[PDB]
Amino acid sequence: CPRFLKVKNWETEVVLTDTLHLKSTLETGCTEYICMGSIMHPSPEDVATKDQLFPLAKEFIDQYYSSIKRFGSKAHMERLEEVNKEIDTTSTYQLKDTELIYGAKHAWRNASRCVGRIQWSKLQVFDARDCTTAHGMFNYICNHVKYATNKGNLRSAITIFPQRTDGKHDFRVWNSQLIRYAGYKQPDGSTLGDPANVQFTEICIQQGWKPPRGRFDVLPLLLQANGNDPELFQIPPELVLEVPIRHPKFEWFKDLGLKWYGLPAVSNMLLEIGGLEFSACPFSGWYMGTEIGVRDYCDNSRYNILEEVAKKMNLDMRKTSSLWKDQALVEINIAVLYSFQSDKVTIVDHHSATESFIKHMENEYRCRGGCPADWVWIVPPMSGSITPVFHQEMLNYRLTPSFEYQPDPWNTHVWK
Amino acid sequence: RFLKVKNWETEVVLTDTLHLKSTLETGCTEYICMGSIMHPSATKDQLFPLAKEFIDQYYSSIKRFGSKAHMERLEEVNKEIDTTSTYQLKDTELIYGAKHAWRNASRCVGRIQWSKLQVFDARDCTTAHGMFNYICNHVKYATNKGNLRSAITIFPQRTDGKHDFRVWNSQLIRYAGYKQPDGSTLGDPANVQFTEICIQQGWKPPRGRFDVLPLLLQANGNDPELFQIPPELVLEVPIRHPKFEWFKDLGLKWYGLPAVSNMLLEIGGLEFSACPFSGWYMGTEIGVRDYCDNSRYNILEEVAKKMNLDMRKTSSLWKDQALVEINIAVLYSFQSDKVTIVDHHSATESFIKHMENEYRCRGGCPADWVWIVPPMSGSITPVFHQEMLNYRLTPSFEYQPDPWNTHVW
Ligand code: HEM
Ligand code: HEM
Numbered sequence: 001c002p003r004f005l006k007v008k009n010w011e012t013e014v015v016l017t018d019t020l021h022l023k024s025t026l027e028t029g030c031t032e033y034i035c036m037g038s039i040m041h042p043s044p045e046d047v048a049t050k051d052q053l054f055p056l057a058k059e060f061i062d063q064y065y066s067s068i069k070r071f072g073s074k075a076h077m078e079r080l081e082e083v084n085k086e087i088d089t090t091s092t093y094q095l096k097d098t099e100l101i102y103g104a105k106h107a108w109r110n111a112s113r114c115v116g117r118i119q120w121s122k123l124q125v126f127d128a129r130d131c132t133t134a135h136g137m138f139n140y141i142c143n144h145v146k147y148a149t150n151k152g153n154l155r156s157a158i159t160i161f162p163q164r165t166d167g168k169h170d171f172r173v174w175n176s177q178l179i180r181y182a183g184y185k186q187p188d189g190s191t192l193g194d195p196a197n198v199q200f201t202e203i204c205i206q207q208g209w210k211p212p213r214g215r216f217d218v219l220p221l222l223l224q225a226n227g228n229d230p231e232l233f234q235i236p237p238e239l240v241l242e243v244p245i246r247h248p249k250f251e252w253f254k255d256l257g258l259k260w261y262g263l264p265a266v267s268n269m270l271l272e273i274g275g276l277e278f279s280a281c282p283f284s285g286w287y288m289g290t291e292i293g294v295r296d297y298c299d300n301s302r303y304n305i306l307e308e309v310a311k312k313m314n315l316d317m318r319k320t321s322s323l324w325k326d327q328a329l330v331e332i333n334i335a336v337l338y339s340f341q342s343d344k345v346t347i348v349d350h351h352s353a354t355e356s357f358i359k360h361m362e363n364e365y366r367c368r369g370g371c372p373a374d375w376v377w378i379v380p381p382m383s384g385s386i387t388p389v390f391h392q393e394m395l396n397y398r399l400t401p402s403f404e405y406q407p408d409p410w411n412t413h414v415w416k
Numbered sequence: 417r418f419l420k421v422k423n424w425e426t427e428v429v430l431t432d433t434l435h436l437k438s439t440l441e442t443g444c445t446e447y448i449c450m451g452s453i454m455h456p457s458a459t460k461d462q463l464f465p466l467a468k469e470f471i472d473q474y475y476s477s478i479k480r481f482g483s484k485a486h487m488e489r490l491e492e493v494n495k496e497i498d499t500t501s502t503y504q505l506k507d508t509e510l511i512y513g514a515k516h517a518w519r520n521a522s523r524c525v526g527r528i529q530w531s532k533l534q535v536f537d538a539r540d541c542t543t544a545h546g547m548f549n550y551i552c553n554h555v556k557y558a559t560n561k562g563n564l565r566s567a568i569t570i571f572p573q574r575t576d577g578k579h580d581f582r583v584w585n586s587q588l589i590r591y592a593g594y595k596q597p598d599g600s601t602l603g604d605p606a607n608v609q610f611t612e613i614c615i616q617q618g619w620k621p622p623r624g625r626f627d628v629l630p631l632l633l634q635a636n637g638n639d640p641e642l643f644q645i646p647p648e649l650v651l652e653v654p655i656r657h658p659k660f661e662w663f664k665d666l667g668l669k670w671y672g673l674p675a676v677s678n679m680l681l682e683i684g685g686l687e688f689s690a691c692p693f694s695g696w697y698m699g700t701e702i703g704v705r706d707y708c709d710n711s712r713y714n715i716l717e718e719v720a721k722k723m724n725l726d727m728r729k730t731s732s733l734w735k736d737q738a739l740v741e742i743n744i745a746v747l748y749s750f751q752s753d754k755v756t757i758v759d760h761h762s763a764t765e766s767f768i769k770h771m772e773n774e775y776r777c778r779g780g781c782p783a784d785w786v787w788i789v790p791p792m793s794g795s796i797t798p799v800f801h802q803e804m805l806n807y808r809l810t811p812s813f814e815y816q817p818d819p820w821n822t823h824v825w
């Protein structure tokens with residue numbers, strides 16, 4: 001690799017130099033002969049060995065004391081030694097509260113696919129490593145939801161449960177997000193609610209959940225503690241902020257009966273810190289409008305409302321080149337933004353978000369020597385080229401600590 | 417190893433074997449992806465193997481791989497490189513190579529058309545007057561009174577590098593751009609530099625919003641020369657809107673024929689520094705990028721004003737609304753004037769079908785998601801949800817430096 005990699009913005013001519021890539025840790029999937037930049041997941045029940053864990057821990061510890069300007073200090077060398085003794089006698093080790101907080105914040109700072117990272121340092125970290133039961137997990141998650149929601153003034157947060165040990169005692173949240181709507185396949189092949197969540201719903205129903213079988217039913221939490229069978233809990237409905245979707249100009253838009261929930265809370269990723277694995281680490285921010293307005297609502301295999309909206313807009317839907325789809329899409333996204341703002345629930349539009357991300361990325365290049373970014377994900381799902389990120393060259397690479405994908409728990413769980 | 421790509425909307429999974437045949441680098445490494453970098457990073461000795469590879473895949477394409485004809489061709493090519501340090505492509509080879517440069521263009525969403533390409537062989541050309549003749553004929557043929565036909569014109573190959581043929585225009589047809597005293601730009605800001613060179617070389621500029629630039633043509637490494645395309649060969653479309661009657665009062669128009677003239681065609685180790693090619697427009701090329709890029713004609717604000725939209729807050733999505741209307745106008749204008757054009761829904765749709773074709777008949781299809789996905793309405797087109805492998809096959813179209821940066825007068 002070269003020491004200096006340069007990226008250009010083609011709209012502003014601004015050029016930035018990246019050195020942070022030298023710190024890259026794992027593989028991207030690309031080679032010199034092929035690029036897998038548009039593959040969603042470019043790639044066993046066993047855990048890190050002693051010898052594998054030593055250098056990963058030391059790497060993170062080094063980076064931590066380096067961040068607080070105490071590199072090579074007595075406390076640094078002592079912490080190294082303590083960590084080394086712990087690994088050597090227990091095959092694992094425990095993070096200090098400060099190290100945990102630093103690690104969580106940096107996994108977010110390092111998330112190449114996140115357009116919201118200007119916020120990374122303002123993450124509230126809830127330490128749930130004392131948790132031992134699913135009831136306890138439920139307590140922590142509820143407290144998380146209430147804090148994060150803040151009566152609509154959303155605050156970003158992460159709750160972190162005990163790290164993996166032997167891989168047979170994992171903590172998992174089986175939900176893909178803390179709050180999602182149920183999806184139900186009908187005998188006639190149609191889907192009620194959210195087609196994205198049909199499989200998870202069927203699992204909940206199997207596990208005992210009695211479904212309301214409506215259009216927007218909040219799923220229960222399915223929580224696994226210490227590798228035991230997962231348990232169902234209903235989130236107190238008052239903890240679940242929702243926004244009915246209406247439109248500034250089209251009075252009929254409310255008649256569509258759409259709503260969405262305020263808190264986006266991904267709960268199925270793995271947080272890796274210093275070689276330690278936190279398989280349950282629900283985190284939440286707030287929405288960019290297109291997440292709801294374009295993807296959740298207008299994806300074909302989601303709520304797929306474009307046609308019904310375009311019909312009420314009395315658009316000519318017979319030719320594609322009338323751009324009836326594009327026209328309808330804009331009005332839906334206007335509605336989503338308008339309804340959140342009206343209800344004073346935090347949300348950010350794709351223009352503001354991408355403009356803040358360019359400012360963030362620049363600052364990162366200046367103060368950090370780079371900012372990994374996944375263009376394929378950073379560019380919004382509509383209006384791409386009228387946002388500043390479209391024209392921005394980016395380098396993608398993996399820094400640690402990081403959020404990682406992990407397989408769905410029902411696929412691996414040994415049922416007791 | 418065999419690689420799979422998945423469409424997350426349809427769950428269709430295709431298997432790539434074709435990438436195994438690439439040899440050119442993409443710019444990525446195992447540790448760092450550069451998929452969003454616009455431009456990443458001969459001798460007798462080097463030339464023959466490149467030639468061999470091309471001849472090999474040519475005779476393979478006509479199911480005569482290892483034939484007496486094939487062997488004699490290799491030998492003929494070896495002898496020729498020996499006695500001349502280069503070689504000449506057969507007419508068949510030229511046409512094959514040009515179609516496959518298009519076929520291999522990872523960033524082109526229009527490649528379902530790849531084998532319908534009219535190839536004009538201009539390798540006998542010697543002077544800029546000759547290039548001008550060939551280019552007028554190309555333009556006339558490709559334009560076809562609005563029923564556009566894909567075409568490429570191939571001028572003589574690079575020899576010593578001191579004698580290149582170059583079309584200095586980035587496209588055969590483009591509008592001039594002018595740096596104004598007050599500081600602003602009249603016409604196309606993308607072409608301000610090129611416009612200045614034409615003016616400096618003697619072109620008398622109308623100084624309008626849509627002045628068609630002259631051809632600036634360089635033959636055999638000599639100073640480039642100026643030519644006016646006969647106006648009757650330049651097909652243009654006034655942009656109007658099917659609902660907004662005031663839209664025509666914006667005085668917008670564009671040309672029908674998109675004809676990229678600054679790329680380099682490489683075939684079997686040979687480099688064709690002048691190879692203007694044309695097809696037809698996808699509406700967003702004009703309606704989104706040409707018209708609404710901040711650094712281009714930049715008309716979003718004017719349109720939104722006429723639509724009387726609230727422009728005080730960005731969350732009103734006034735930009736997004738205006739953008740769709742401009743693109744409705746562009747498609748509607750071309751279609752009313754019967755000038756070939758494709759919308760991004762239909763084009764991306766075709767491209768998915770084309771991928772399936774290619775995976776089936778060829779074992780893959782190199783594709784650059786960053787370029788294939790349209791500059792608006794990404795996820796409501798099928799390509800958004802389509803995983804793509806990008807890799808570099810040859811024959812190819814490559815970037816090359818602008819010749820004023822290189823030329824000695
Ligand atoms: C605070 C406001 C935030 C905004 C506006 C935001 C925005 C986004 C958006 C729009 C995406 C793409 C979503 C998609 O297309 O599915 C994303 C991805 C992501 N974000 Fe953020 N985010 C925020 C907070 C956070 C926080 C607090 C974390 C972690 C602590 C985080 C970590 C991630 C990760 C790991 C991804 C990629 C996940 C994947 O690859 O599937 N984000 N973000
Ligand atoms: C026939 C109808 C065609 C359509 C609808 C079409 C469409 C497109 C579009 C929309 C782009 C992106 C351009 C941009 O964003 O600036 C593109 C790129 C490209 N096309 Fe096609 N195209 C067509 C024909 C052709 C032909 C005839 C050739 C060559 C023989 C060709 C070769 C290329 C190449 C090399 C690029 C990428 C240029 C670069 O990397 O900068 N295309 N095409």
Ligand SMILES: CCc1cc(CNC)cc(OCc2ccc3ccc(N)nc3c2)c1
Nearest residue numbers: 040116264266284285286287288291295405
């Ligand atoms: C593969 C698992 C997956 C798929 C998808 C598909 N997106 C439509 C999204 C995934 O995560 C998406 C994500 C992650 C973190 C976020 C934080 C804040 C926010 N507003 N949105 C987020 C959205 C994960």
Ligand SMILES: CCc1cc(CNC)cc(OCc2ccc3ccc(N)nc3c2)c1
Nearest residue numbers: 454526674676694695696697698701705706
């Ligand atoms: C990187 C150099 C470059 C930049 C840009 C900027 N796009 C707005 C476009 C470039 O080529 C753009 C191109 C090439 C071939 C085409 C063939 C047919 C067609 N309709 N459009 C094309 C468009 C090259």
Ligand SMILES: C[C@H](O)[C@H](O)[C@H]1CNc2nc(N)[nH]c(=O)c2N1
Nearest residue numbers: 390391392393452453454786787
């Ligand atoms: C930075 C980025 O690579 C650059 O802006 C690209 C993005 N995608 C594109 N896609 C197309 N079709 N055409 C372009 O010019 C670009 N520009």
Ligand SMILES: C[C@H](O)[C@H](O)[C@H]1CNc2nc(N)[nH]c(=O)c2N1
Nearest residue numbers: 038039040376377800801802803
């Ligand atoms: C095939 C492609 O990688 C996939 O559809 C990606 C494209 N870009 C995306 N970008 C974001 N922000 N979110 C997504 O889910 C996706 N999906």
Ligand SMILES: [Zn+2]
Nearest residue numbers: 030035444449
């Ligand atoms: Zn790559």
